[PDB]
Ligand binder design. Sequence first.
Ligand SMILES: Nc1ncnc2c1ncn2[C@@H]1O[C@H](COP(=O)(O)OP(=O)(O)O)[C@@H](O)[C@H]1O
Ligand SMILES: Nc1ncnc2c1ncn2[C@@H]1O[C@H](COP(=O)(O)OP(=O)(O)O)[C@@H](O)[C@H]1O
Ligand SMILES: [Mg+2]
Ligand SMILES: [Mg+2]
Lengths: 74, 160, 371, 371, 118
Amino acid sequence: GKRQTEREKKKKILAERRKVLAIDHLNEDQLREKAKELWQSIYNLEAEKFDLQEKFKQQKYEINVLRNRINDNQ
Amino acid sequence: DDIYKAAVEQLTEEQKNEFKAAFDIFVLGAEDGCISTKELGKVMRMLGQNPTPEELQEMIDEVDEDGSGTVDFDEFLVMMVRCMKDDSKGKSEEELSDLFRMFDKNADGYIDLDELKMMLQATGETITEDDIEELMKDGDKNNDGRIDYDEFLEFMKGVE
Amino acid sequence: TTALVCDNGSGLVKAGFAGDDAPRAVFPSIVGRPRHQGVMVGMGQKDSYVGDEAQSKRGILTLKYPIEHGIITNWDDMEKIWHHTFYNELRVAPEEHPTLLTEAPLNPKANREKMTQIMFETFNVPAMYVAIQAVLSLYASGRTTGIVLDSGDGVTHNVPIYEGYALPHAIMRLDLAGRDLTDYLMKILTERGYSFVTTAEREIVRDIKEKLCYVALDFENEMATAASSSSLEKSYELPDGQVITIGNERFRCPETLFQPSFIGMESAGIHETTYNSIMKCDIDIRKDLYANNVLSGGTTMYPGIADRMQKEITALAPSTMKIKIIAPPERKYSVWIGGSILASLSTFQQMWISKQEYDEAGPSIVHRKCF
Amino acid sequence: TTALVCDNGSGLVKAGFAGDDAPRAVFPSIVGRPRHQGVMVGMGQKDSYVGDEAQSKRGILTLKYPIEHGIITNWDDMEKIWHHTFYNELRVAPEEHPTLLTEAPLNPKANREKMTQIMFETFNVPAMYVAIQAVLSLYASGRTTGIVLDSGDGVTHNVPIYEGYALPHAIMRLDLAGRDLTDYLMKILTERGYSFVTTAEREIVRDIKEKLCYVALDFENEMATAASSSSLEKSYELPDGQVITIGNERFRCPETLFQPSFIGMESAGIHETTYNSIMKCDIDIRKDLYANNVLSGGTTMYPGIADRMQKEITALAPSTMKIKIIAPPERKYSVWIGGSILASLSTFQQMWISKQEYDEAGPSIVHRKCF
Amino acid sequence: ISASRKLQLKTLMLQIAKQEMEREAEERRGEKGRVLRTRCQPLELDGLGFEELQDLCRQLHARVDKVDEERYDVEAKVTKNITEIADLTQKIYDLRGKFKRPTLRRVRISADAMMQAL
Ligand SMILES: Nc1ncnc2c1ncn2[C@@H]1O[C@H](COP(=O)(O)OP(=O)(O)O)[C@@H](O)[C@H]1O
Ligand SMILES: Nc1ncnc2c1ncn2[C@@H]1O[C@H](COP(=O)(O)OP(=O)(O)O)[C@@H](O)[C@H]1O
Ligand SMILES: [Mg+2]
Ligand SMILES: [Mg+2]
């Protein structure tokens, strides 16, 4: 396996399994609402990405704490 | 200073039962409630409560210093309730770790005396004999030149 | 930023930032799943211990190397090893660091292409470059000519170089290396009564080989001496007591290098494949190659090999040429030191395989101009 | 709700709610029907006195243990014992409490399946789980490795464990235990004139064994000393007077543990089956097992056994390893304390055999994933 | 050394810690809002013709695919990092407090005063 399944999953998520959307094919109010949906989805997901960045920060802090404890104890 | 004393002011009947049992063991009526600290520790260990000799020795070194053996009721009840463990889980471990990483800005895997003392002065509390060097003496068990979150627990565990 | 000089190797993964003297983290490349059942609950038992962690719990694991002979036979395990190396032994995310892997000569293409594809897709490095393991060992010696014999643990290869121009028709790659010596030692120890079978006990036999074995200057005289006196028998304490005494197994294990007929291999020893590699070169650069023979790799650390090899080559070579064998004390990490030097060069800074180039030509970019 | 940590054992049933320090009710597991006729009318004479009640009326009963060697030979009596344990010694209906029985290693399957079928059909518990009696004793010591010798009253078994991974091929179960020592003591007491025959007098001999016997540090020296001086003769008062004097029967009764040839058993003592159990383990975890040898079970409470066993193993083992024998003062209830700890864990809360699972797969569910 | 001020000190520390945590949460929220606004510009919906919305939604969809790739990347990263962090937390626990989980006890309670009732 090595990871070919994992990369296949990655590609499917980024290209296929994403919310693959045909957008510019709708009536004026319909296209407007779909654009609003896309914009809101981007907003919420970007908030989530910031949360992931903050979690990366917390995990880094925990790693530093664990490393200092290990070095002190071993 | 205030917690156990106020609880004495608002005494509950649950602790009141043990208070009266110990008093009748000591005071048979129409007395000043002297209750010598030596006898206080002996009976506290005797009455099936927590047999911790450390609190008894602290009280003996602390009370009956007048040479009379009499113990004021306020301090008697305070030491009775404090021999029993009065704490609510010492908050949450992960919560306290987050509190301390907010406190600890260096983030070198530990925290030094400087951040701890800055937070201490941010708390806004008076300074007494157990300040200044009691924290240094207590936290420096292996004397690593720092007081980490684990060392901060080692100093004053069960923070409420 | 700084470059990551990783060096997969086969037996010890050596890594570290470019521009230092020694690799930052050196640890065996083994991934061992537990094999027993496990009854304690909540002990926090993982499903695979990699690196140096599995050399401490090896009593209940089944260690298996992911690299057999230079080539990589188990890609998932190799990916796990790389992930461990990046995240736990160096603690630097690969998204912000170029990498410089190393590869043995004459290896299958698919191995190299898969390596670059992994590095670009999974770890998502900015740029990676693959270099032949012998040119680096020549860098570390500070030379620019010479024929380098890099007897690793997986495969022994012998790349001659002159004035910076490698001679591709004179590379002699032989698959006898440290692992086969470990297996042969484990096989001849049975002649005294000590039986090592488990894949965990192969590590114990490897430790015996490292600490006790040495290369004899003259084989027959040593065989005669060890059969009469007892001045050679050195004892060694197993991980549980019951000391063992190694007799003439001491210099018979590494003698396989100069007589590969011991383990049934047909080819000639490392003393004669170097001379053959020289004789394939042109007639005018043979003196320089004779004078600048370089040793590298772990397995060339046996006490007394730099004299046996010189004696053998002097026997083979013409009497007029001077035979000199360069054996630096930092032999084991010679390849990695050379890798650090190469990655620290300014002239080399534009040879990396940039990610946009890979996106345009696919993994087959490595065989192209960016070698 | 809280879990019921029952522990059937063989000789003493120990039970109590999970999360405490000591079992709530400990009482012998004997069921004795009356044997004489009975002339008083209306005395309220029952047909079977179980538990600690039959240790007070034992003068007119015929006590018979329902568990011979770990296995259960008389299911009706065992059901009666369980019913008594639940309703009268704990006074908690089983309809509202999970149960955690314990079972010796290498026991017949049918015993375990019948046990779970009874617990689910008759008492109708919400969920029950069966655990090996040695892993719990390892829990109680707060370790995670070590080889535990759990010499109960029915059967002595020796389960080695490393890093939480039990080694199923190294379990050495031996059927010599406290009951055979009681019978042998009752058999050697006849050499002075005291004859105990009735099944009620076996209890008196058991009391003699508990209060007087001790394990000799060196057997031959003690045999020589007791045959010359009289400093060992300790006296004991029977339940009716007529004191008796035990001479060298004191250390000859528990010596059977280290020389099972006394009662005609072929196998080697508990001092050598531990070493054999260690030697079956892998070569890299033998040091840890040597250093963390754990004792448990009732029969390991003889005064002076933790020194005799250490001396014997040090004689057998290689001279370099350190031999340490963990003998906590709370040896008798070690298995139950470990059971309480295991039942109190959050990670373990989803391993119970839920009743709906039993309804779908029958009693053979116990051998399945829910072990 | 007085046992008097332990309660006041710990309560004051708790108050300071809660204030710091809520302040950090609020500033994180403000930073996240600013970063979102500078990463995803607010939608413009004033007097746009049909083609204006067509083009804007096309640009938004291209950005949607781009950010979907970015966030699936950071999501896989956070999944791997969280898994590894939990594993190392468990490793540190079994390294240090594994000898203490058995010590988690509520003992010496009922049997202390249940002796002479027999
Ligand atoms: N001091 C030593 N003496 C003898 N043999 C050694 C010594 N150190 C390492 N080796 C052998 O060399 C091997 C390590 O070789 P190494 O250079 O790490 O291989 P690679 O080229 O894959 O990095 C080990 O397997 C061991 O058998
Ligand atoms: N203090 C003691 N000294 C010597 N032997 C004892 C002592 N206490 C119990 N025993 C022996 O151990 C047996 C009880 O063992 P126990 O651990 O209760 O078995 P189980 O594993 O079935 O619970 C008794 O039959 C008795 O022979
Ligand atoms: Mg190499
Ligand atoms: Mg038992």
